[PDB]
Amino acid sequence: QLKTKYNDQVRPALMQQFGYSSVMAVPRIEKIVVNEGLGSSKEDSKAIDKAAKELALITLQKPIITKAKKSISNFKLRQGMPVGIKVTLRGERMYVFLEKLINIGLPRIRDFRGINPNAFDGRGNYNLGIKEQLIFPEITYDMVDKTRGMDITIVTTAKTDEEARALLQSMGLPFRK
Amino acid sequence: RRKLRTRRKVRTTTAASGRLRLSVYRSSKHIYAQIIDDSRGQTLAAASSAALKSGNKTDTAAAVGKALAAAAAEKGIKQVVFDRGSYKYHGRVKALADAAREGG
Amino acid sequence: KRTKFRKQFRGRMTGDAKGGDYVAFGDYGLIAMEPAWIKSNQIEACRIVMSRHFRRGGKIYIRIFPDKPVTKKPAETRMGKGKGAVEYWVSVVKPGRVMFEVAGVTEEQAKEAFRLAGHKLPIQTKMVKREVYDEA
Amino acid sequence: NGRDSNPKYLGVKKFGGEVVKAGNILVRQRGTKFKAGQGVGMGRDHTLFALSDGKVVFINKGKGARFISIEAAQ
Amino acid sequence: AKDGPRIIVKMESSAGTGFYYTTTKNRRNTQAKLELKKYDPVAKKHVVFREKK
Amino acid sequence: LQIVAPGPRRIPQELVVDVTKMNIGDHITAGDIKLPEGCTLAADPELTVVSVLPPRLTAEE
RNA sequence: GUUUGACUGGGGCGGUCGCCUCCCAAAAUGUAACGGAGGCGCCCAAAGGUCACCUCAAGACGGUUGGAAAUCGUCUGUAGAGCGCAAAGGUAGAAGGUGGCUUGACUGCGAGACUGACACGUCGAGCAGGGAGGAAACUCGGGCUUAGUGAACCGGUGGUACCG
RNA sequence: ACCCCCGUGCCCAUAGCACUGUGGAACCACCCCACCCCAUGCCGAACUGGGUCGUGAAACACAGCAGCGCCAAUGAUACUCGGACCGCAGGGUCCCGGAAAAGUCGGUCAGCGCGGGGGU
Ligand SMILES: [Mg+2]
Ligand SMILES: [Mg+2]
Ligand SMILES: [Mg+2]
Ligand SMILES: [Mg+2]
Ligand SMILES: [Mg+2]
Ligand SMILES: [Mg+2]
Ligand SMILES: [Mg+2]
Ligand SMILES: [Mg+2]
Ligand SMILES: [Mg+2]
Ligand SMILES: [Mg+2]
Ligand SMILES: [Mg+2]
Ligand SMILES: [Mg+2]
Ligand SMILES: [Mg+2]
Ligand SMILES: [Mg+2]
Ligand SMILES: [Mg+2]
Ligand SMILES: [Mg+2]
Ligand SMILES: [Mg+2]
Ligand SMILES: [Mg+2]
Ligand SMILES: [Mg+2]
Ligand SMILES: [Mg+2]
Ligand SMILES: [Mg+2]
Ligand SMILES: [Mg+2]
Ligand SMILES: [Mg+2]
Ligand SMILES: [Mg+2]
Ligand SMILES: [Mg+2]
Ligand SMILES: [Mg+2]
Ligand SMILES: [Mg+2]
Ligand SMILES: [Mg+2]
Ligand SMILES: [Mg+2]
Ligand SMILES: [Mg+2]
Ligand SMILES: [Mg+2]
Ligand SMILES: [Mg+2]
Ligand SMILES: [Mg+2]
C-alpha cells in the first residue's frame, strides 16, 4: 500500500542533489482532489447518483455532491441541485489511489506518452490530464451510461514549479519526447 | 480561522458582566489557564502544566485546573469567570472545567 | 456632444473654474472669461470652425464637454409636470477654464483659428501660452 | 413623481456631557451608526437607550468606532 | 392583516382548556401537515395543544 | 520629465531628443532618452514621450 | 324624495389621494410644488429562539461531451459580495453561509424616554408565573432596521360567570 | 533588575504589506499515529485525541530596511458668520474675524501594561 516508496529514496534524491535544510523542506503531496462535473448530465434526480458510485467504488471514499450557487450562465444555470460531484483524497487513502493509478490506471490509456510537461501551476501544484473516464482500471465499456471523464488535481508542497516536476519524478512521471 | 478565538473573546462582554475572565490556552499537550481582571489591565491567579508532569496523560489539566482553583481560592474570587478559545468543549478542556468548577 | 446613459436632469448654480488648467495638450489654448453654458453645438461648430482653418489636422483638443441636460415647454403654460428631456445638452464652464487647445500650428496660425471660433461663442475669450507647468 | 413619504425623526437625542436618566434615549439612528458602550443598551430599532442614570459620553476614532456610554455621579 | 381566498391564513390555537386562544398567522405554503405548539392557559403552564380547524 | 540627480549646479535645464530617425507611427519611449551623469528615470521606461502622428485620413461617405 | 368628492397656475379631460426609501432640504430636527427617481398592501413553521462551527464578489495560471459563463486546483482577494423584496444607513469579531435542539412569533406588568395639535405611533431596563438553547456567563415576550395598514359603530365565534 | 519566550489587554496602519536575516530541547509550530471519546453535509486537512525522534523548513517570533502604503506641516488659496456694496442679469467686490480639501516639506516600519516559563 506504498507510503514507503515516498519514504527513503524520493526525499534525498532531490535533497542530496539540489540540497535542502531539512527532510521537512523536501517537497511533499498533501492531497489528491477528484471531482467529476455532472453538468453535461441533465439526468439529475435520475442518474446523478450513478457517478457517485463510480468515484466511491474507485477511491473507497464517499463523494460530496457540489452545488450550483445558481449563477446565470445565460444558457443553463438554475438554482440548486448538484451540477457536480467531489471527493478529496489525502493521507494513505490518497496513497492507495495514487499508487493504484500510476501502476495500473495510467498504462490503460491509448498511446500514452504522459501528461503535458508545460507549466501547470507556477505555485508548484499539479493537475491531471484525464480525458476519458473509461481509462481507469475499475471502469470499463461493459458497465457505463455514456462516454465521459473526470478531473484530478495533485496538491503538492513544492515551493517552485521547477521543484514541482522535480518531486513529480519517481511516482510515474512520463514526458514529452 | 484566527477569528475563531476573537469570536469567543468578544462573545463575552467583559466588564458589563461584573465577573472576571479565565483564559485557558492550549498549545502543546500542556495547557496554561490564567484568570484576568477585565476592567483593570491586570491578571489574577495563574496555573500551568509547566512545572508539571503531575499526570502523564494530558488530562493532567485536572491538576492545573485544581491548581488554579486552589491558587485562586486563596485570593477568594470564585464565581463563574471562564473564558475559552478556538478549542471546543468536553475532552481535555472539560477536564479543566470540572477540575475548577466543582473543584474550586 | 450628447452622451450615453445618465442621471438625466439638473438645476443650476455658479462658482469659479475648478478643474480647468492654464495649459495642456499643446502650445496654445482657449480660455473662457464668463460663467455660462455651452451646448452640444457651439463647441461642435467651434471644432468645425477651427479645423476648417487648419489643414484639417487632428491637432485640436477640446477639454470642454456637454453633460448637463436642459429642458423646454412642450407647447406652453404650467399645466402638468416638469418636462422637456431632450431639448439640448450643455456644458457649464467657469472663468479661467481652458476650452480648446491646438497642436503644432504657429503663432498667427492658431491666433486666427481661435479668433474665428471666438465668434459662435456666447462669451468673450482669450488664448494663451505656457509658463506654469503642472503635471501630477 | 410626487410620492415621497414621511419625516422619520432620526437623531442623537442626548448629546455628550448631558445627564441622562434611566430609560432615556441617547440616539435614534438607522442601523449601527453608534455602537453601544458601557452602561448602554440597544433595541429592535437599534436606537441606544440608558441602562443606568448618569452622565453620557461620546467616544470615537474613525469608521464604526463610534460609541455611546454612561457613568454615574454621586 | 387583510384577508382573501389566497395563500397562507390566520389560524387560531388549540384548547388549553381552559377554553383558550392564541392565533398566530400561518401558511399553507410549506405544508398542510397541520400543527401543534406549546403555550400557557389559565390552568398550569405550558399545556401544549394542537392548531385547530 | 521628473528624473533626478546628481548635481543641482549642473541640472538638466532641457532635454535633447533627436527625431530624424522616426517617421510615421513611431512611438519614442522614455528608455530611449539621453540623461548623462546617471540621472535615473522618474517614470516607467516604456512611457511614451514623442510620437509622430499620421496624416489625416478618411474613407467612407 | 335624493345622490352625483376633492386636488387643480380658471373649470373640464387626464392624472393624484394612505404607506416605505433617496434627492430637493441651505453640514441640528422640521420644511412646499400637477418637482426630480423607485417601491408597499407581502413573505418566512422556519428566513424565528438559542447553541455551535463556516467566509464572500472578481481576476490570472492549469485543468474532462463542459464553451463568454460551468465543476476542480492553487494565488491574489477591507468587501470590489451577500443580506426574500425599494433605496439609504448598516454590516468581516457579522445581521450574511450550514447544522444541532426547539415553540419567547409567551400570560401578568411596565422604570423612564423618542414623536404627534389630538388620536396614533416607536424604543425599553427591570419584576413575577412558567419555559427554551448552553457546560457556563447568558440570551429569548419574531424577523439588519426603516413599508406589508383601518378609529368607532353594528355583529360572528370560544370563554367568563359581573348585570339581569 | 536585565535578555527572552508563552499568554492576555490597552491603543484601535505614523502600529500594514511585500523584499528579507536571525531563531530551535526552553517556549511555539509543523511532524507522528489514532478502533474507539470527538468530528469532517467528501477527506481527522478542520475540530479532536495519543506522543517522541526529526525540523527551524512552513506558520509564528524578533532585528533589518523608509520601494508601496498610512500619518502629514508652515505658505497661499477656496469657501464663509458679521459688516458695507457694483451689475438689467448670469454673476462679481471691499472690510472683519473664522478657515478647509488637495499638494509640497516631511514623519514612520509603533506605544503602553498584567501574569507565568526559561537564561544572566
Ligand atoms: Mg447661485
Ligand atoms: Mg485638480
Ligand atoms: Mg424624508
Ligand atoms: Mg483611528
Ligand atoms: Mg373643485
Ligand atoms: Mg387646468
Ligand atoms: Mg376648482
Ligand atoms: Mg401619475
Ligand atoms: Mg436636514
Ligand atoms: Mg439647516
Ligand atoms: Mg409650509
Ligand atoms: Mg409635495
Ligand atoms: Mg425639481
Ligand atoms: Mg449570524
Ligand atoms: Mg442544560
Ligand atoms: Mg425583558
Ligand atoms: Mg357570547
Ligand atoms: Mg505571544
Ligand atoms: Mg537549548
Ligand atoms: Mg496531519
Ligand atoms: Mg516567511
Ligand atoms: Mg496655514
Ligand atoms: Mg476667490
Ligand atoms: Mg456678507
Ligand atoms: Mg442692485
Ligand atoms: Mg466670488
Ligand atoms: Mg466678524
Ligand atoms: Mg479672510
Ligand atoms: Mg486661522
Ligand atoms: Mg492638507
Ligand atoms: Mg513627496
Ligand atoms: Mg519588522
Ligand atoms: Mg513579563
UniProtKB/Swiss-Prot annotation, chain B:
<dbReference type="Pfam" id="PF00861">
    <property type="entry name" value="Ribosomal_L18p"/>
</dbReference>
<comment type="similarity">
    <text>Belongs to the universal ribosomal protein uL18 family.</text>
</comment>
<dbReference type="GO" id="GO:0008097">
    <property type="term" value="F:5S rRNA binding"/>
</dbReference>
<comment type="function">
    <text>This is one of the proteins that bind and probably mediate the attachment of the 5S RNA into the large ribosomal subunit, where it forms part of the central protuberance.</text>
</comment>
<protein>
    <recommendedName>
        <fullName>Large ribosomal subunit protein uL18</fullName>
    </recommendedName>
</protein>
<comment type="subunit">
    <text>Part of the 50S ribosomal subunit; part of the 5S rRNA/L5/L18/L25 subcomplex. Contacts the 23S rRNA. Contacts protein L27 and the 5S rRNA.</text>
</comment>
<keyword id="KW-0689">Ribosomal protein</keyword>
<keyword id="KW-0687">Ribonucleoprotein</keyword>
<dbReference type="GO" id="GO:0022625">
    <property type="term" value="C:cytosolic large ribosomal subunit"/>
</dbReference>
<dbReference type="GO" id="GO:0003735">
    <property type="term" value="F:structural constituent of ribosome"/>
</dbReference>
<dbReference type="GO" id="GO:0006412">
    <property type="term" value="P:translation"/>
</dbReference>
<keyword id="KW-0699">rRNA-binding</keyword>
Swiss-Prot record, chain C:
<keyword id="KW-0820">tRNA-binding</keyword>
<dbReference type="InterPro" id="IPR000114">
    <property type="entry name" value="Ribosomal_uL16_bact-type"/>
</dbReference>
<dbReference type="InterPro" id="IPR020798">
    <property type="entry name" value="Ribosomal_uL16_CS"/>
</dbReference>
<keyword id="KW-0699">rRNA-binding</keyword>
<dbReference type="InterPro" id="IPR016180">
    <property type="entry name" value="Ribosomal_uL16_dom"/>
</dbReference>
<keyword id="KW-0689">Ribosomal protein</keyword>
<comment type="function">
    <text>Binds the 5S and 23S rRNAs and is also seen to make contacts with the A and P site tRNAs. Interacts with A site tRNA mimics, and is probably one of the key factors, along with a helix of the 23S rRNA, in positioning tRNA stems in the peptidyl-transferase center.</text>
</comment>
<dbReference type="GO" id="GO:0019843">
    <property type="term" value="F:rRNA binding"/>
</dbReference>
<dbReference type="GO" id="GO:0006412">
    <property type="term" value="P:translation"/>
</dbReference>
<keyword id="KW-0687">Ribonucleoprotein</keyword>
<comment type="subunit">
    <text>Part of the 50S ribosomal subunit. Contacts the CTC protein (RL25).</text>
</comment>
<dbReference type="GO" id="GO:0022625">
    <property type="term" value="C:cytosolic large ribosomal subunit"/>
</dbReference>
Swiss-Prot record, chain E:
<comment type="subunit">
    <text>Part of the 50S ribosomal subunit. Contacts protein L35.</text>
</comment>
<keyword id="KW-0694">RNA-binding</keyword>
<dbReference type="GO" id="GO:0022625">
    <property type="term" value="C:cytosolic large ribosomal subunit"/>
</dbReference>
<dbReference type="GO" id="GO:0006412">
    <property type="term" value="P:translation"/>
</dbReference>
<keyword id="KW-0689">Ribosomal protein</keyword>
<dbReference type="InterPro" id="IPR018264">
    <property type="entry name" value="Ribosomal_bL33_CS"/>
</dbReference>
<dbReference type="GO" id="GO:0000049">
    <property type="term" value="F:tRNA binding"/>
</dbReference>
<dbReference type="GO" id="GO:0019843">
    <property type="term" value="F:rRNA binding"/>
</dbReference>
<dbReference type="InterPro" id="IPR038584">
    <property type="entry name" value="Ribosomal_bL33_sf"/>
</dbReference>
<keyword id="KW-0699">rRNA-binding</keyword>
<comment type="similarity">
    <text>Belongs to the bacterial ribosomal protein bL33 family.</text>
</comment>
<dbReference type="InterPro" id="IPR011332">
    <property type="entry name" value="Ribosomal_zn-bd"/>
</dbReference>
From Swiss-Prot, chain F:
<comment type="function">
    <text>This is one of 3 proteins that mediate the attachment of the 5S rRNA onto the large ribosomal subunit. This protein has three domains. The N-terminal one is bound on the solvent face, the middle domain fills the space between the 5S rRNA and the L11 arm contacting the 23S rRNA while the C-terminal domain is on the edge of the intersubunit interface and contacts the A site. The protein conformation changes upon binding of a tRNA mimic to the A site, although the mimic does not interact directly with CTC itself, consistent with CTCs presumed role in moderating A site binding.</text>
</comment>
<protein>
    <recommendedName>
        <fullName>Large ribosomal subunit protein bL25</fullName>
    </recommendedName>
</protein>
<comment type="subunit">
    <text>Part of the 50S ribosomal subunit. Contacts proteins L11 and L16, the A site tRNA, and the 5S and 23S rRNAs.</text>
</comment>
<comment type="similarity">
    <text>Belongs to the bacterial ribosomal protein bL25 family. CTC subfamily.</text>
</comment>
<feature type="region of interest" description="Middle domain">
    <location>
        <begin position="1"/>
        <end position="61"/>
    </location>
</feature>
